[PDB]
From Swiss-Prot, chain C:
It comes from Severe acute respiratory syndrome coronavirus 2 (2019-nCoV). It comes from the Viruses. Changing residue 37 to L: In strain: Eta/B.1.525. The chain holds residues 852 to 895 of 1273 of the full protein. The lineage of its organism: Viruses, Riboviria, Orthornavirae, Pisuviricota, Pisoniviricetes. Subunit of the fusion protein that is processed upon entry into the host cell. Mediates fusion of the virion and cellular membranes by functioning as a class I viral fusion protein. Contains a viral fusion peptide that is unmasked after S2 cleavage. This cleavage can occur at the cell membrane by host TMPRSS2 or during endocytosis by host CSTL. In either case, this triggers an extensive and irreversible conformational change that leads to fusion of the viral envelope with the cellular cytoplasmic membrane, releasing viral genomic RNA into the host cell cytoplasm. Changing residue 5 to K: In strain: Omicron/BA.1. This is Spike protein S2'.
Curated annotation (Swiss-Prot), chain D:
Changing residue 48 to Y: In strain: 19B/501Y, Omicron/BA.1, Omicron/BA.2, Omicron/BA.2.12.1, Omicron/BA.2.75, Omicron/BA.4, Omicron/BA.5, Omicron/BQ.1.1, Omicron/XBB.1.5, Omicron/EG.5.1. The gene is S. This is Spike protein S2. Changing residue 16 to K: In strain: Omicron/BA.1, Omicron/BA.2, Omicron/BA.2.12.1, Omicron/BA.2.75, Omicron/BA.4, Omicron/BA.5, Omicron/BQ.1.1, Omicron/XBB.1.5, Omicron/EG.5.1. The lineage of its organism: Viruses, Riboviria, Orthornavirae, Pisuviricota, Pisoniviricetes. Changing residue 48 to H: In strain: B.1.1.318. The record marks 67-68 as: Cleavage. Precursor of the fusion protein processed in the biosynthesis of the S protein and the formation of virus particle. Mediates fusion of the virion and cellular membranes by functioning as a class I viral fusion protein. Contains two viral fusion peptides that are unmasked after cleavage. The S2/S2' cleavage occurs during virus entry at the cell membrane by host TMPRSS2 or during endocytosis by host CSTL. Glycans are attached at residue 53.
Length: 113, 99, 44, 79, 337, 49, 49
C-alpha cells in the first residue's frame, strides 16, 4: 500500500486501471489514497560455465529487485561485476553477459561489440 | 552439427511427451481405459471415458499443430537449401555474402 | 506495464544503444571502404 | 472407445490428412535440393587436376559405402 | 523378568555428518541405463545424524527410547557382533502390539506381540571357566504376552559372541519403514577399514523382507550385550564390561531423488533437487552432464505476512438505547416485541 | 470447469504467438539477405533494393 | 514372449523402459526372463496403376 499522488472524487471508494484491475482503494477512516501492487514473483535462472570446466553456479532473477550485483535484467548473485569488456558467450540480457574468467570465478560484464 | 541434433532431440522429446501424456488422467480417477472398464460399468463411466477421450484429443492436435509448424521451417530451410544449391553450387553467384 | 498474474516481459540481449552502434559501424564501413569490409579486411 | 470415436472420426481424418500432408511434403523436399541433374557423371580414373587434391570430397572405393571420408565423419558426429 | 541399573557417569551424545548414505531401491522392478526420479522417503545427503556410543573404555551405556518417525536409518560399523536386535512399539506396557526383532546365535525370529518390556531390555553373555567360549544365557527382554497375530522366522544367521577392542572391519546398514501397515527392511553388508567418519562411498541397500504387520510404531529401543568375565564380580550394579561397539541412528524424510542405473540394473549415483542449484539443474534436465547456457529450474514467489482489516469509519450502531431507556413499559400479558 | 476454460485460453495464444514468430523469422531473413546484398556490397538484382 | 539375454537381479519381478513400459517380465516358477513385444499393427496400402 504505497502513497499515491492522485486525488479521488469525494464519492468513490474503489478504483481501477486500463487493464481493469483494482489497484487503488481509498481508506475510509482517514481519507488517503493507497495503491495496490503485487509483492514479487519471477523465476530462478542459473548460469553454468559448463562440464569439465567448473562446479559453481549463480542464481539469476528475471525481474525481482534486490557477490551481489544489481543488473538491468533483474538480480544476479554469486557473480562479480567487472568494468572491463570482453566478448561474451552466455547471453543474459540488457547488454550484459556472463563468463568464466580469472583463482578463476564467474564474472559478469557488458559485452564487447 | 547443432541444427540436426536440435531437431532430432525435439522430435524425440515431443514424441516421448505424447507417450507420457497417455499416462495422464486429465482430471479423471485413472489413466488407462481398461481399468475404468473393468472396475466401473460402461453406463456410469461414460463421462469418465469421454473426458479421457477428450483429454487425449487435444494431446493429438497440439502434437499436430506442433508437427505442422515444424514442417514450416523445414520447408523454409529446404527452399533456402534449394536456392543455395541452384546459386552457389551450379555456377557462380554474384550475390556477395550469400555463399 | 505488464505486472499481473503470470506475465513478465524479458529484456532483450541487445537494447537500443548497441544496435545503434552497429548501424554506425556499418555506415562508417560503407562510406570509407565500400564493399571490401563485408568481404574481408577494410580497404581504404 | 471406437463407438465414442465415431463422433470424433472427422477430426482424426483431419489429423491423418495433415500427417499425410507433411509426409508427402517431406519426401518431396529431398527432390528439389539433390535431384537437380538427371545425368550421373563420373570422375576420370587418373586424378590429375594440376595440384588440387580431391580425395577428401571424392568417394573412395576402398570402403563399401559410397560416402566420402568427410561424409562418414559427419555421419558419425550426429546421432 | 528384568533388573534395574544404577546411576553412573555416562557420556553425552555427539553429532556427526553423513556422506552419501541412506540410499535403497525404492521399487521391485528393473531399470537399465535409466535416469528415473521417484518420490520416496530417503536420507538427505550431508544431513545431520544422531550418534551414540557403546564402547566400555568410561562405562558408556546409552540406549534411550527414541521416537519413530516416518522411516529411520540405522547404520552400524559392527566388528565383534555386539549388537543383537531391535524392538518397536508405542507405549510398551502390554496394551498394543510391539515388535521384537532379535538376531540370536541359532536363528532369527520376528515375533510381534504385547510383550511386557522393562526399562532396559538386554542380553547377558557369560564366559565359562571350563569352556573357552562366549555363551548367552540372560534372556531378559520381556516378561510375558497375552495374545498376538503375526510371527515369522528368518534364516539361521551364524553369530559370533566374542567381543574385542580392535578396529572395525565391517559396516552394516538397516532401514525400517512403515507405509500402508507394511514393514520394510533394507540391509546390505559392506566391508570397510575405518573407525570413524564414514566414507563417501555409494552402496544401494537391497530389500530383505516385506513382513505384513499393520500396527502403529512410534517408539523403538536398541538391545546391547555385555560380558561377565572373571575380572568383574558378576553383578550388574557397578562392575561390568561391554567390549567396543558403536551404532548410528538416523531419521528419514520425504525427498525427490534422481537415480542413475547402469547396464547391470544397479544404482550408482543419486542427485537431489532441493539441496544444490547445481543438483537442481542436473535433475530437471534428466541428465548428469550440464553444458553452458541459460537454464530455468523453478520459480520464486513472496508470501504475505500479515492480514489487516482497516474497516470503514461509517460503522453504524444498534438501537439498544431507547429500548432500555424507555419511559413506558407494557404489561406482562401484553409484552412488546 | 475454470481450469479447462483457462487451458483452452492459453493454447490459442501459444499458437498465434508461434505463427507470428514464423512470419517475423521470414521477414528477418529477408532483411539479412537484402542488407547482405544492398548494404554489404552492390546487388545486381533488379527491383530488389 | 521372446527369450531375452539380459539377467535380472534376484529381487525384481518386472522391467520397464524409458517409457516405463513393462517390456520385460520374470517367470515366477523356473526363473526365465521373457520380453513383451506388441503383436502386429499397421495399415493396408493400395498401389494403383
Ligand atoms: C590428399 O590428402 C590426403 C589426406 O587425407 C592424403 O592422404 C594421406 O597421404 C599421406 C602421405 O602418404 C599418408 O601418410 C596419409 O595416411 C594419407 N591419409 C589418408 C586419410 O589417406 C593424400 O596423399 C593427398 N593427395 C595428394 C595428391 O596430395
Ligand atoms: C440510558 O441512559 C443513561 C444515562 O444517560 C446512559 O448512561 C450513560 O451512558 C454513556 C454511554 O457512553 C456514558 O458515557 C455515561 O457515563 C452514562 N451515564 C451514566 C450516569 O451511567 C445509558 O448508557 C443509557 N442506556 C443505553 C443502553 O445506552
Ligand atoms: C473517523 O472517526 C473518528 C471518531 O471515531 C474521528 O476521530 C476521525 O476524524 C474520523 N475520520 C474521518 C472522518 O475521516
Ligand atoms: C530496488 O530496491 C532498492 C531498495 O528497496 C531501491 O533503492 C532501488 O531503487 C530499487 N530498484 C529499482 C530499479 O526500483
Ligand atoms: C572500472 O573503471 C572505472 C574507471 O573510472 C571506475 O570508475 C570503476 O569504479 C571501475 N569498476 C570497478 C568494478 O572497479
Ligand atoms: C548438527 O546439530 C548440532 C546441534 O544441533 C550442530 O552443532 C551441528 O553443527 C550440526 N551439524 C551440521 C553438519 O550442521
Ligand atoms: C534365540 O532367541 C529367540 C528370540 O525369542 C528365541 O526364540 C530362541 O529360542 C533363542 N534360541 C535359543 C537357542 O534359545
Ligand atoms: C487378540 O487377537 C485378536 C485377533 O485375533 C486382536 O483383534 C485382539 O486385539 C487381540 N487382543 C488384544 C488384547 O489385543
Ligand atoms: C494408528 O495410529 C494413527 C495415528 O496415531 C491412528 O489414526 C489410527 O487410528 C491408529 N490405528 C490403529 C489400528 O491403532
Ligand atoms: C555388468 O555388466 C557389465 C557390462 O559388460 C559386465 O562387464 C559385468 O560383468 C556385469 N556384472 C554382473 C554382476 O553381471
Ligand atoms: C515352484 O515349484 C515347482 C514345482 O515343485 C518347481 O518346478 C519350481 O522350480 C518352483 N519354483 C521356485 C522354487 O522358485
Amino acid at each position: 500500500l504505497t502513497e499515491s499522488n492522485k486525488k479521488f472524487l469525494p464519492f468513490q471508494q474503489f478504483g481501477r486501471d486500463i487493464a481493469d484491475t483494482t489497484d487503488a482503494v481509498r481508506d475510509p477512516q482517514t481519507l488517503e489514497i493507497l495503491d495496490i501492487t503485487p509483492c514479487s514473483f519471477g523465476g530462478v535462472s542459473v548460469i553454468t560455465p559448463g562440464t569439465n570446466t567448473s562446479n559453481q553456479v549463480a542464481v539469476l532473477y528475471q525481474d525481482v529487485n534486490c557477490n551481489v550485483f544489481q543488473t538491468r535484467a533483474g538480480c544476479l548473485i554469486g557473480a562479480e561485476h567487472v568494468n572491463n569488456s570482453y566478448e561474451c558467450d552466455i547471453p543474459i540480457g540488457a547488454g550484459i553477459c556472463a563468463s568464466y574468467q580469472t583463482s578463476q570465478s564467474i564474472i559478469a560484464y557488458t559485452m564487447s561489440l | 552439427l547443432g541444427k540436426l541434433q536440435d531437431v532430432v532431440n525435439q522430435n524425440a522429446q515431443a514424441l516421448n511427451t505424447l507417450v507420457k501424456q497417455l499416462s495422464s488422467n486429465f482430471g479423471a480417477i485413472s489413466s488407462v481405459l481398461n481399468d475404468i472398464l473393468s472396475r466401473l460399468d460402461p453406463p456410469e463411466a461414460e463421462v469418465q471415458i469421454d473426458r479421457l477421450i477428450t483429454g487425449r484429443l487435444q494431446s493429438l492436435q497440439t502434437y499436430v499443430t506442433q508437427q505442422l509448424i515444424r514442417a514450416a521451417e523445414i520447408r523454409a530451410s529446404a527452399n533456402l537449401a534449394a536456392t543455395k544449391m541452384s546459386e552457389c553450387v551450379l555456377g557462380q553467384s554474384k550475390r556477395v555474402d550469400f555463399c | 506495464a505488464q505486472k499481473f498474474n503470470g506475465l513478465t516481459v524479458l529484456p532483450p540481449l541487445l537494447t537500443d544503444e548497441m544496435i545503434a552502434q552497429y548501424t554506425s559501424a556499418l555506415l562508417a564501413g560503407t562510406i570509407t571502404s565500400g564493399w571490401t569490409f563485408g568481404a574481408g579486411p577494410a580497404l581504404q | 472407445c471406437s463407438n465414442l470415436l465415431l463422433q470424433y472420426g472427422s477430426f482424426c481424418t483431419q489429423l491423418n490428412r495433415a500427417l499425410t500432408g507433411i509426409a508427402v511434403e517431406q519426401d518431396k523436399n529431398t527432390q528439389e535440393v539433390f535431384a537437380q541433374v538427371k545425368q550421373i557423371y563420373k570422375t576420370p580414373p587418373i586424378k590429375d587436376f594440376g595440384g588440387f587434391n580431391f580425395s577428401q570430397i571424392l568417394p573412395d572405393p576402398s570402403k563399401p559405402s559410397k560416402r566420402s571420408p568427410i561424409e562418414d565423419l559427419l555421419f558419425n558426429k550426429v546421432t | 523378568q528384568c533388573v534395574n541399573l544404577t546411576t553412573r557417569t555416562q557420556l553425552p551424545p555427539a553429532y556427526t555428518n553423513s556422506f552419501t548414505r541412506g540410499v535403497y531401491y525404492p521399487d521391485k522392478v528393473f531399470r537399465s541405463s535409466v535416469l528415473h526420479s521417484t518420490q520416496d522417503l530417503f536420507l538427505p545427503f550431508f544431513s545431520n545424524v544422531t550418534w551414540f556410543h557403546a564402547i566400555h573404555v568410561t562405562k558408556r551405556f546409552d540406549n534411550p527410547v527414541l521416537p519413530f518417525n516416518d522411516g529411520v536409518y540405522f547404520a552400524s560399523t559392527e566388528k565383534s557382533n555386539i549388537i543383537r536386535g531391535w524392538i518397536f512399539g508405542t507405549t510398551l506396557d502390554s496394551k498394543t502390539q510391539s515388535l521384537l526383532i532379535v538376531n540370536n546365535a541359532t536363528n532369527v525370529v520376528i515375533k510381534v506381540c504385547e510383550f511386557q518390556f522393562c526399562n532396559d531390555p538386554f542380553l547377558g553373555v557369560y564366559y565359562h571357566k571350563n569352556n573357552k567360549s562366549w555363551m548367552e544365557s540372560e534372556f531378559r527382554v520381556y516378561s510375558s504376552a497375552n495374545n498376538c497375530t503375526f510371527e515369522y522366522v528368518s534364516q539361521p544367521f551364524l553369530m559370533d559372541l566374542e567381543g574385542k577392542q580392535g578396529n572395525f572391519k565391517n559396516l552394516r546398514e538397516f532401514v525400517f519403514k512403515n507405509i500402508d501397515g507394511y514393514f520394510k527392511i533394507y540391509s546390505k553388508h559392506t566391508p570397510i577399514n575405518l573407525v570413524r567418519d564414514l566414507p563417501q562411498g555409494f552402496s544401494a541397500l537391497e530389500p530383505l523382507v516385506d513382513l505384513p504387520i499393520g500396527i502403529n510404531i512410534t517408539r523403538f529401543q536398541t538391545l546391547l550385550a555385555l560380558h561377565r568375565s572373571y575380572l568383574t564380580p558378576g553383578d550388574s550394579s557397578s562392575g561390568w564390561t561391554a567390549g567396543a561397539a558403536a551404532y548410528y541412528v538416523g531419521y528419514l524424510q520425504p525427498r525427490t531423488f534422481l537415480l542413475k542405473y547402469n547396464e547391470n540394473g544397479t544404482i550408482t549415483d543419486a542427485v537431489d533437487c532441493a539441496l544444490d542449484p547445481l543438483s537442481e539443474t542436473k535433475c530437471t534436465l534428466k541428465s548428469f552432464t550440464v553444458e553452458k547456457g541459460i537454464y530455468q529450474t523453478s520459480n520464486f514467489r513472496v508470501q504475505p505476512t500479515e492480514s489487516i482489516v482497516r474497516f470503514p469509519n461509517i460503522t453504524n450502531l444498534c438501537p439498544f438505547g431507547e429500548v432500555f431507556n424507555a419511559t413506558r413499559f407494557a404489561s406482562v400479558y401484553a409484552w412488546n416485541r
